[PDB]
Each structure stands twice: as structure tokens, then as C-alpha cells.
Symmetry: C3
Subunit: 224 residues, 3 copies
Amino acid sequence: YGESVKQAVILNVVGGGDSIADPLSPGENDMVHRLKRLEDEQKGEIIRTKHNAQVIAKFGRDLEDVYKFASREHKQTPSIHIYAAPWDSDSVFIFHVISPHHLNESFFLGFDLEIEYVHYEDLAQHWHSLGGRTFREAYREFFNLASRSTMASDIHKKRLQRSRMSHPIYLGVHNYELSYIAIKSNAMQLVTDEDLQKHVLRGPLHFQRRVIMAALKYGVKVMS
Amino acid sequence: YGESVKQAVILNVVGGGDSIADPLSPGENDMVHRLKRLEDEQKGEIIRTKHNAQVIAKFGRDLEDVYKFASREHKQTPSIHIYAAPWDSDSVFIFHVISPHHLNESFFLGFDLEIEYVHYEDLAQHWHSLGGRTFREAYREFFNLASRSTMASDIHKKRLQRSRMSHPIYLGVHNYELSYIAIKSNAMQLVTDEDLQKHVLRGPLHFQRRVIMAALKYGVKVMS
Amino acid sequence: YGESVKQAVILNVVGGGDSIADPLSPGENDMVHRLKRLEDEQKGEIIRTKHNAQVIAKFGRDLEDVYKFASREHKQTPSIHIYAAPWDSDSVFIFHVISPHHLNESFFLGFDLEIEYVHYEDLAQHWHSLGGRTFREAYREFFNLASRSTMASDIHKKRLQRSRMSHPIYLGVHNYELSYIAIKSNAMQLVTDEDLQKHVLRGPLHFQRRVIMAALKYGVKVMS
């Protein structure tokens, strides 16, 4: 039963009430932006039309009075940068999440949906004296960990290893309305909580990539 | 040649003239709904604008008369519930079609596009004295029949068997404007008529899932 | 570094600034057409509304004068036809590009994204006396060349061979604003220039099929 309501809330986010595009589709991202602009303009046009109706009605009244009178006298946000792996591009991809106001505050979130694996790493740099993997390293590491899975197909492992030594494909940026700290916590919830993870990392690829974004925006509340 | 016109009519349905969303994409379903609302509002705004133009013109005329006058004196529907299999989610999915006005009138339609198999079962309950598989059973049965295909890859069969003992992923509901009896007949046409079936169960996955819905709405008329 | 700007310009085309639909999705093609119509109508409605505001304001002024007056006296384009292979439909597809004003001027462009292969052939007929593969042949040939790739999976080769002897699935027509000669040159640039090709034939399938169209519209300028 518990499963029922989980599915229901998840489904409600990625249906209406959230304009989430597939992170691997810059085209769907454009389309979602275009629908939003159209909605916003249409609201504005409704306002203008009603303004014009009111001005018109007021002039009708004034016209009546002028008739009568004459008649008498007649007589910033965290940026989520998206990269697909050069192999199995639809299933293997990486987020680079950047804090808007710290030079070196960011984290990595890597996904292999073929084996349903997610890896998080903090990339922040912090100096301490009483008074830190690079992005590339995190990328390379991620392919090693994924190729480790016993669940990984022999052929899968081979493409993971080739992606590891190749350049990823940048697909652009998402910007949602939450803090660095919140998205960071969401990302870690995604990796640490096994239940949430099993609910997010499943179903048709297109839907699951949107659900991933929903999980980034809400964490466990993606099933609230 | 006959093939040509078939392709043409099929293509015409899933192009314009039918707002069919991919059943496995709640996001595309939302988008199609949003485009419809925008179209509907835009028609209404066109009407309001023209109303305002007419009222304005009428006031122009009235203003003329007032000028002249003063101048003289100057001197329900079946619900299609959609579930993806937990494995091969993009290719293996199930419809539960529910009659709007009978407590226990529904049917199952299961699809495996990897092997291009479709299975129909009536789930209705009818008592008879002169005066019936459950949904779960139909689900379990479906994976058995599919794993039977000689055409099924060894690995395919294994995931079918795992899906059989796992919980499917609900992706929501479609509601089209036809009767239970008609959609039911369409579903059976889909399974019984080999020609229609070969025309519906092919091509890129996204397109084929939309064509499936078109077939549910029109049956053989999907190629008329 | 050079890679960076390439990715950036590519991404800019298939983001905004170009309404490119996935060639394998007649549904997305319809949707893109619908968004365009809505945008076009909304611009027109904005114009009508402002016209009405101006007419209204002018009538307000006129009304004032009538009040005052009364008060005193008080005392063609190349067509790109799209066909998916009957097997591996999402990855194996063919363009038939037809000149608008020559009976027998067209070319073939075949793609297998599984092995990232593109094949171009001129299908034009030209008679010469001082004073030519068919479409089918080009189709059949294409599957032979693709099944030749050493990179091709054994199973891949088998489906290529079956597609070769079967009928492709027509998915419709795209029409972009360029000449036959230009698109023809673009198509050949795509096949001859190894760099462009490596930049176009990669990433998630949906994105890569859109990038292919972008390459057809711009050639090397797709990375300018």
C-alpha cells in the first residue's frame, strides 16, 4: 500500500505542478521554456483585454451623460551542468552542481541507469589553519566505481572504461529555486537513503531522468 | 502499394488531428494538456478582442450622432491505466482498461515490443444462474507467455521472469472519447488481426507507443 | 579548449534559435508546429489589443471635445523524407532528399548510430551526349556497407541484413529554408569531414538526431 502513495506523489510532481525537462534533452528544455513564455504572455493579454473592456464601458457611460447634457440644452541559484558519457549516452551521465557565490564550491553527481548506480562527491576546496578531487578526477573515479559493479554486463564495463578516458558531452544547465545547501542535501539523500533511491532509479528512461531532477528539487519530499 | 496508404493514414493520425501522448511519458502528457489549454484560451481571447473592436466601433458611431445632434443645437469515459514493467521499462508495459459504470468490468492489454508481442485478457466477473483472472494473475500470466517466445533473447526471458515477481511502475491514466465496448473491440482487433498488428507494432519506440494508442482509439480504422 | 566552443555552438542551435524536431518523432514535429502557430497568433493578438487601446484613447479625446463644444453652447524547398529501418528503428534510418524543381534530382543519406556510420549517395539521373542507383538500390547497398563495419556487433549485422530485405517505415517530411545545392553540400560535408562527423554523431539518441538535422541545415557552421 505504502508503495501506492509513493508512486502517486512522484507521479504528481513530474506530471503537472513542476515544469521539469529531461536533463538529456536540450530540445525539451527549450520547449518547456517556450510553453512558459506563452502562458505568461497569455495571462498578460487577458489583463490588457479586460482593461480595454473597462475603459470602453466607462466611455459608454460618459457618452450617455454627454448625450443627456446636450439634450437638456437642446431645450542567484545553483547551476546544474549536465554531461552525458560518450558511450551509452542515454544511461550514463553526470551533473556538476555549482554554488552561485563561492569560487570553488561545487559537487558531482554521476548516474549509470543501466546498473541503477548513483555516485556523489563533494568537490569543494577548504583551507584550515586555526586563526578535494578535481571535476576530472571525480569523472574518472566514477567510471572505475561503476565498472566495479558485479551487476555490470561485460560489454557495459568496456564502454564505462572507454568513457573514462574520453571527453563527456555537455548538454547545458538547469536552474531550480533552492539553495546550494538544500540541493546538496537532496543529492546526498538520493545516495544514502536506499528506499528513495529505489523509487527514483527505475521506469522508462525519459521518465526516470525527470524523476531524478524531481528528487534533486525535493529529496525525500519527492514521495511525501 | 497498399502499404503506402496504410503508412500514410497511420502517420496522419499520430501527426496532426489527434493529440496522442506517449503513454510512458507523463511529461509529454502534461505538455499536450498545456498546449490544448493554450489553444483554447487563445481562441477565447480572439473572441474577446473582436467583441471589444465591435463595441468600440459602435461607440464611434454614437459619438458621431452626439456630435451632430449638439452641432444643430449649436445653431464518463473508459480509463486506461498505464504501468511499465520494472525491467526493460521502455519496451514492456501494460494497460488496465476500466469501464466507467461497472464495478468489475475491465481488461488487460500487455505489450513486449522487444519481441513485438501483445496479449489481451478480459478481467470481467459475471455471475450466471438462470433467473475471471485478477489483475495480478493477468500480470503474472503475461510474463510467462512472453518468456515463452522462441524469439525472446535469453537475457530478455530472465528480465521478464524478474518483472513477473516484482511490482510494476504506475505512469497514470489516459481518457479517450469512446465507449468501453468500442475500446474493448479495438483491443481485440489489435490482437486478432495479424495485418493491423504488424503495422502497429513497429518503428521507433516513441512513435510505436503513440501508434498503439491510435490503434486503441480506432482499431483497423487506424489504417482506413 | 576548441572542443568547448564547438559543443557550445552546437548546443546553441538545438536549444533556442532553431525549431528542430526529432526526425523520428512525428509527434514532436506536430508539437513544434503547434508552438509556432501559438507564438504567431499571440503576436497578432498583441497587435490587435494595442490597436483597440489606441482607438479607445482617440475616442476618449473626441468625447472630451464633444463635451466641451456642447458645454460652450450650454451658455519551394527541398523535401527531406524520413524512413526508419524495420529493425533497430531508433538507430537505423534514412533520408531521401528531393529537389523541388527537377523530376529526378534527389540524394540518399543513411545513418546507423549504433556504429556511428553515415552513407551519402547521389541518386540523380543525367543524360550526356555533346549537343544512377535507384532509391531501393541505395537502401539495399546501405545495409551491406553498414553490416561490413568490423565495429558492428554480430547481432547488429543480422538485423541490418533483415532490414535490407524488408520495407522501411515512412515517418514523414521536413522542409528547411535552404537550396537543394546547399543541403546537398551539407550532406557531403557531414560524410567527408571527419571532425564535424565526430561532433555530430554522438550523445543521447534524441539529441543526436536533432543535431543531425542541424548539421543538414548548416554543415560545418553547426560548430562556427
